[PDB]
């Protein structure tokens, strides 16, 4: 809980980032900074900070659990809790607010290895083929 990390979109190769205009927008690898691209999970919605902890060397302790556990996404620098726009497939837009809503808990499901490998083959192929189409156009 509270560990900084990046979130990458598997089939597009871009990282979840917060723009200066306080909006989530996938932005590229070559410009993906820790300040823009860093998120954390916290047990609940309370504002007490996790603080500075000594980073272990190994597994550590199994804390965040798939499905059963409930997590909350948080940008590291700004403290803006991640919520829904609540306006309207639903296409409910996702932004971050100071307090968000009551039902801002997000659970996790682990993708199987076959799905994870296929989702990377798709990205590795859509790039080479887009390179080929552009060469043919030239």
């Amino acid at each position: 809980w509270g560990q900084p990390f990046r979130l990458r979109h598997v089939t597009t190769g871009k990282y979840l980032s917060l723009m200066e205009d306080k909006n989530l927008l996938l932005m590229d690898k070559e410009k993906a900074d820790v300040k823009s691209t860093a998120f954390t999970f916290r047990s609940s919605k309370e504002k007490l900070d996790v603080g500075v902890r000594k980073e272990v060397d190994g597994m550590g302790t199994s804390e965040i659990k798939y499905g059963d556990s409930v997590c909350y996404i948080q940008h590291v620098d700004t403290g803006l809790w991640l919520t829904y726009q609540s306006v309207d497939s639903i296409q409910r837009k996702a932004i971050m607010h100071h307090e968000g809503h009551m039902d801002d808990g997000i659970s996790l499901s682990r993708s199987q290895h076959e799905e994870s490998r296929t989702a990377r083959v798709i990205r590795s192929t859509v790039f080479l083929f887009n390179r080929f189409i552009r060469g043919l156009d030239a």
Binding site: D57, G58, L128
Partner: protein, 40 residues
């Protein structure tokens, strides 16, 4: 306590290159689907 490497462990191979007096850590990488060659 010192840790030892064993089989079935997941590791990355790191090499250090000092270009124009600037240390840069590089990891052995490869994209095994469609490109058998390895890069850094």
């Amino acid at each position: 306590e010192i840790q030892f490497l064993r089989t079935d462990d997941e590791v990355v191979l790191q090499c250090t290159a000092t270009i124009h007096k600037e240390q840069q850590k590089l990891c052995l990488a490869a994209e095994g689907f469609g490109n058998r060659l390895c890069f850094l």
